[PDB]
Write a protein that binds this ligand. Structure first.
Ligand SMILES: Cc1cc2nc3c(=O)[nH]c(=O)nc-3n(C[C@H](O)[C@H](O)[C@H](O)COP(=O)(O)OP(=O)(O)OC[C@H]3O[C@@H](n4cnc5c(N)ncnc54)[C@H](O)[C@@H]3O)c2cc1C
Ligand SMILES: Cc1cc2nc3c(=O)[nH]c(=O)nc-3n(C[C@H](O)[C@H](O)[C@H](O)COP(=O)(O)OP(=O)(O)OC[C@H]3O[C@@H](n4cnc5c(N)ncnc54)[C@H](O)[C@@H]3O)c2cc1C
Lengths: 446, 445
């Protein structure tokens, strides 16, 4: 019998299981499924934890998610094609819900799917080895409930371990002497810790502007954004300055490429992440910068040096959940034989075509349209329910318009569901005043 | 014949030094490869501002913080082959700051010429034993080149430490607590807690010293809670002693009293686990922190596989001298200088050490035991003997001084067990000595 190892029970791992399960509901015979997850519960990034650095078992803490996090884009842009917001909540909700709400929603689908049973929680994957003699993988894991290390054999391996958890943490001169907190976006947890403080935000990611927004929204004295990249275009609040790149700091102050100086209390490095898989050797290890099209991934999923090994969600994410679904539905169908693979040379070449296309992209719009086209190519091949991608692209377009209008009020906008045509209403509380991030307070009429 | 040494901390340096001191005397040593994940040696002593994961994605190793000073008297760890007098050339006080002790440790290891064996910025991924080969496969990631490579070795000596991977227990409410929660492992700079109420959970040397560090640098209040036995230390006025924590809310802690108090930050000083993600269970040491872990014959030899070794995996009352003793022994086992008893015999010997370990109650007995342990390992090798009883005496002097006044024990002096000279009082009292640099400590300030 065929056995599949699914590494991670985040949205990608949840999608992979949901993919096989939906096919089983259709009457098809599926392979055995084993999903390994180092946390105690599913949700991946979305499973909030107070912990930082290393976890209860000594494993690097996975979630980079913080308190007061709300949907970064329109919820309409991440809605499942097979499990609507209407089906789960039973009513309309605003367009940018808090983390817990989007956690509830993603848990809802897999709970209904009945896939929890395939997952071995509290279990860290240690090593994945491809045996040439038998054409199978040995997957070595550490079960922290039993405190035992074991391995099993698998025919296919789908890696869903994410790529926003191992931080890229560059050093600047003076860091050793600095009297205040220095952390990466990854350790950022509670904006209250920075109340009445001057927080330096180093680098230019999407989290940079959001972490800043949370610190602003919860009473930080001042916010300083410094970055070597192009102006973001966003007009910030009164107590929010921009600077060119950081050069050094001392016991108290930050010094800039500007020639300028300033007192800062905490430094938050929003410098991004690295694709890090310490459980893989180089034959299987994906190595790439964070981008829309990494190489060595046929259809962005199939590992070209070993087409029995797969990666979900390893691309940078304009689209998220339904990309993972599209990806997992494709991976399923390749595993199940429903879609035979071309030659390695043919795969390599198809991948190069997607790569050259990527290098020609010069606008935000070209980028998510590109990824939207990649998703279209994926769902065309399988029985994943198709949805209006071009209309998703317009919703994204609207979202970037709303960001440019006012960077602090973009979450007060509402959008039309592309799955059901349901119009999201204005939330009861405007973002800047919605200090309570609970699912209970959000779904309330109060 | 090849040896892999995992870690370039004091234990890995001890193991490298052992082989270089067989060579220096006139022997034919095996090939040495020392893998180190940091960019430099020192282990705990290589201080970093970093927390959680390092620049490469590896767990930050060091648990050491700004303004850290020698835990005990420097006399108790003085190297026989390399005295404090030789290194510095002048007399110094008995509790030097990290930087000064680091200059000292660095000193001896540089004059040993062993750096050439160490591949830095290299993290050990996996170690496997091949029955058919009777040799170990050590897979590694080299972060300078981003390359993962396997190499074969005849013996492995694991020196990856056990004070870096935290035991981090959760309390009810932690999720909603509005202040910082960090482990002792993440503690870096006491300045961050100026004018703040800090809760310290758990009992250890570091709990005491982290609190002291916060107190010295201007914390508004400190609160110590634990389940273990109190020492009855005479704490300051703004230092509070409470029974175990039960709960926290947005800003308040709740104790077994039923009493509550607002706290700005919580520092979990709850110890560490022996964590070896590079090993399978065939090789992997499983133990709580104690004087006598099992499956370690003479505390060093892995009993299920005699060709695999652990250094410094015991709880540390003695430190550097223990590693040296353990390193010397392991070297002589590796070099065929000492034959091993059968698995049945090794386990008998280890059982007796464990029975004696469970009888130990007092500080005095703990030192004696580990003292006696090191003596046993020293007698089997060409390692120079030292005055263990006098070291214990000096250790006990220090614990008595802690009990007199926890805030002043570092101002006391002790007699060098190498020169017999009484160390001079330091130019600045500890509570006023805010500058922790080597330069400030060595000058006439
Ligand atoms: C700060 C932040 C904010 C974000 N906000 C949004 C947003 O607002 N909207 C949006 O659409 N997307 C957002 N994202 C993007 C996010 O990546 C996706 O929403 C989604 O979480 C990706 O799912 P994933 O399963 O592919 O990866 P992850 O969510 O990271 O899941 C990886 C899983 O694998 C597990 N794992 C990793 N290593 C091992 C191991 N060795 N052994 C066992 N298990 C392992 C982890 O525990 C985890 O469960 C955000 C990301 C970050 C970092
Ligand atoms: C906070 C603190 C304060 C202390 N103060 C004192 C003191 O004042 N006096 C005293 O005598 N002792 C003190 N100690 C005891 C201390 O453990 C020893 O001094 C000494 O550092 C132990 O050395 P070690 O080499 O066995 O382990 P470590 O010093 O912990 O070093 C282990 C080395 O292995 C490396 N490593 C681990 N895993 C890997 C991997 N997978 N791949 C590659 N490399 C790896 C690490 O980088 C590290 O360098 C203190 C300990 C702590 C935690």
């Amino acid at each position: 019998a065929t056995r599949i190892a699914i590494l991670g029970a985040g949205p990608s791992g949840m999608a992979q299981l949901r993919a096989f399960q939906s096919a089983q509901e259709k009457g098809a015979e599926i392979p055995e499924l084993v999903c390994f997850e180092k946390q105690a519960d599913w949700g991946g990034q979305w499973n909030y934890t107070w912990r930082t650095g290393l976890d209860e078992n000594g494993e690097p803490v996975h979630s980079s998610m913080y308190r007061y996090l709300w949907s970064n884009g329109p919820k309409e842009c991440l809605e499942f094609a097979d499990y609507t917001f209407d089906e789960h909540f039973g009513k309309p909700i605003a367009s940018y819900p808090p983390r817990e709400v989007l956690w509830d929603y993603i848990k809802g689908r897999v709970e209904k799917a009945g896939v929890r049973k395939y997952i071995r929680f509290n279990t860290a994957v240690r090593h994945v080895e491809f045996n040439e003699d038998s054409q199978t993988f040995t997957v070595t894991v550490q079960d922290h409930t039993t405190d035992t290390i074991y391995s099993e054999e698998f025919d296919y391996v789908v890696c869903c371990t994410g790529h926003f958890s191992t931080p890229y943490v560059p050093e600047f001169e003076g860091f050793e002497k600095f009297g205040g907190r220095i952390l990466h976006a990854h350790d950022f947890r509670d904006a209250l810790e920075f109340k009445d403080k001057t927080v330096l935000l180093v680098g230019s990611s999407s989290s940079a502007e959001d972490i800043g927004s949370q610190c602003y929204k919860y009473g930080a004295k001042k916010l300083i954004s410094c970055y070597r990249t192009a102006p973001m275009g966003y007009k910030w609040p009164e107590n929010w300055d921009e600077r060119p790149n950081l050069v050094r700091v001392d016991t108290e102050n930050a010094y800039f490429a500007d020639g300028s100086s300033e007192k800062v209390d905490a430094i938050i490095l929003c410098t991004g992440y690295i694709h890090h898989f310490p459980f893989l050797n180089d034959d299987l290890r994906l190595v790439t910068n964070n981008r829309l099209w990494p190489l060595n991934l046929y259809k962005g999923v199939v590992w070209e040096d070993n087409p029995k090994f797969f990666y979900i969600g390893m691309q940078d994410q304009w689209y998220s959940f339904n990309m993972f679904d599209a990806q997992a539905w494709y991976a399923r169908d390749v595993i199940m034989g429903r879609l035979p693979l071309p030659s390695k040379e043919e795969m390599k070449a198809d991948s190069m075509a997607w790569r050259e296309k990527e290098l020609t992209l010069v606008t935000a719009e070209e980028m998510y349209t590109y990824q939207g086209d990649y998703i279209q190519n994926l769902i065309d091949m399988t029985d994943y329910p198709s949805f209006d991608i071009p209309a998703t692209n317009k919703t994204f377009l609207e979202w970037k318009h709303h960001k440019k209008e006012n960077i602090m009020t973009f979450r007060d906008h509402s959008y039309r569901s592309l799955m059901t045509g349901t119009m999201a209403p204005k939330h009861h509380t405007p973002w800047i005043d919605a200090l309570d991030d609970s699912l209970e307070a959000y779904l309330s009429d109060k």
